[PDB]
Design a protein around this ligand. Structure first.
Ligand code: HEM
Ligand SMILES: C[C@@](O)(c1ccccc1)[C@H](Cc1ccc(Cl)cc1)n1cncn1
Ligand SMILES: [Cl-]
Ligand SMILES: [Cl-]
Length: 444
């Protein structure tokens, strides 16, 4: 009756989940996806995570899925997300409650707030990390990136400063909590889920205590009470305690996991594209030399808009690295696309990273070429690293600012090279198996 996309169901229980989760180099789609697209085409069926699933490497189909969030498709991630991130996190909320949460999230990340608060902390925390590097020393660029993004997010969310007692204790506790979501079940035992569950409860109690402190700050009419998400939400919304807790915790995870891997990806690519670092250094030299002319030390929004080639490397980094491999969706209706039926209730996985590596939309897609973006543009459906539609990444602008400011001072202060062989891998979460060990050398 239905003209389902071609494919197989795999093992009766496991389906094709094992093969689908098999690690692969992050600059490709993997042998599993590559072979399935070659045999069945860009739209095929499978059984993944216990559900009959339609896998889409089709750019047009993926844009259609993303644009019709709430109409024909619906966010539907495995229960691990809802269990760890909370039933009030944006990833498990749909409808009005997701609307409110997303608007609260965007109201806090408004352009005005992104132009003042967030910008200074981004450069502030950027130098805090970069100022401590020492040349000829071999350290993990991945660890350092993670330190930058966590410090920054902890500041924006709860006004927590790097180096405090509660900050370092939060990082240690967050390690265990984070594995409940980003972790390879093929690697990590199931026990980790319950350990991640008990660290979530621990972090929630901490967040609630800080909520009580901020509530006393607001009661006593103390200034700067909107500077962190916790304070802003208390004054400018009527969320409950449970909803605030989930919001702070999920956003910490959201802002931290993606940003750190993005920055680490830029560091990896640039190390192999000296020409891009050379031209990057000129772009930021003539931006800084113009800052000294005015006796300026802090960055302002205008300096950011002057970085046009960094926005190219950013696009090229997200295009090639693919922080997010695919999204989880569910069909709300019987849907037809390119003569293929997607029956209601079926899982649908838009592989948003597929178009980025399609050699019919990009010339030599597996080559890090930042200059392709003076030709190409981010309109259409050739570029979708942040998803799209009603669930377009609400922090995409902050993430680009994070990458821009960090590259700014990074190229100004150091050259760098790979300390040992290392490639990004998708587990499907992107990670450098050897920590991306690098070696820097200051410039003169
Ligand atoms: C390189 C950086 C980033 C990438 C590639 C990225 C990617 C994505 C993608 C693909 C989605 C769609 C998920 C879905 O619809 O199922 C998404 C959603 C989202 N992202 Fe990001 N993200 C990045 C950075 C950030 C940051 C820094 C934050 C917050 C501080 C953030 C917060 C969110 C939120 C809240 C959503 C869901 C919004 C909604 O449900 O309406 N992201 N992101
Ligand atoms: C990378 C991400 O899609 C993901 C990670 C692991 C498993 C499934 C999805 C994640 C999804 C998410 C979005 C909003 C909130 Cl509040 C919390 C999480 N994310 C998006 N942007 C930043 N992180
Ligand atoms: Cl079958
Ligand atoms: Cl099936």
């Amino acid at each position: 009756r239905f003209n389902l996309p071609p494919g197989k169901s795999g093992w009766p229980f496991l389906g094709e989940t094992i093969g689908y989760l098999k690690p692969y180099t992050a600059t490709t789609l993997g042998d599993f996806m590559q072979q399935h697209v070659s045999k069945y085409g860009k739209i095929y069926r499978s059984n993944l995570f216990g559900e009959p699933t339609i896998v889409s490497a089709d750019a047009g189909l993926n844009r259609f899925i993303l644009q019709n969030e709430g109409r024909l498709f619906e966010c539907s991630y495995p229960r691990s997300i809802g269990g760890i991130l909370g039933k009030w996190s944006m990833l498990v909320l749909v409808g009005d409650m997701h609307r409110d949460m997303r608007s609260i999230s965007l109201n806090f990340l408004s352009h005005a707030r992104l132009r003042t608060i967030l910008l200074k902390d981004v450069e502030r925390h950027t130098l805090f990390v970069l100022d401590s590097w020492q040349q000829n020393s071999i350290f993990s660029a991945q660890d350092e990136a993670k330190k930058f993004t966590f410090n920054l997010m902890a500041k924006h969310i709860m006004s927590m400063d790097p180096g405090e007692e509660e900050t370092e204790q939060l990082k240690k506790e967050y390690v265990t909590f984070m594995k409940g979501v980003v972790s390879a079940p093929l690697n990590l035992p199931g026990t980790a889920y319950h350990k991640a569950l008990q660290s979530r409860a621990t972090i929630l109690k901490f967040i609630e205590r800080k909520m009580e402190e901020r509530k006393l700050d607001i009661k006593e009419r103390k200034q700067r009470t909107d500077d962190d998400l916790l304070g802003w939400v208390l004054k400018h919304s009527n969320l409950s305690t449970e909803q605030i807790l989930d919001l702070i915790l999920s956003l910490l995870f959201a802002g931290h996991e993606t940003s750190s891997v993005a920055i680490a990806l830029a560091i990896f690519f640039l190390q192999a594209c000296p020409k891009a670092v050379e031209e990057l250094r000129e772009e930021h030299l003539e931006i800084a030399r113009a800052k000294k002319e005015l006796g300026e030390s802090e960055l302002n929004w205008d300096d950011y808009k002057k970085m046009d080639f960094t926005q190219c490397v950013i696009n090229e980094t997200l295009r090639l690295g693919n922080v997010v491999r695919f999204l989880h969706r569910k069909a709300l209706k019987d849907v037809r696309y390119k003569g293929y039926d997607i029956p209601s209730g079926w899982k649908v996985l838009p592989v948003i990273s597929a178009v980025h590596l399609d050699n019919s939309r990009y010339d030599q897609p597996n080559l890090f070429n930042p200059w392709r973006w003076q030709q190409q543009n981010t309109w259409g459906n050739n570029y979708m690293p942040f998803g799209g539609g009603p669930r377009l990444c609400a922090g995409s602008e902050l993430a680009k600012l994070e990458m821009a400011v960090f590259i700014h001072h990074l190229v100004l202060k150091f050259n760098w090279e790979l300390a040992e062989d290392d490639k990004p891998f998708a587990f499907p979460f992107v990670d450098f198996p050897n920590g991306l060990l690098i070696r820097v050398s200051r410039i003169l």
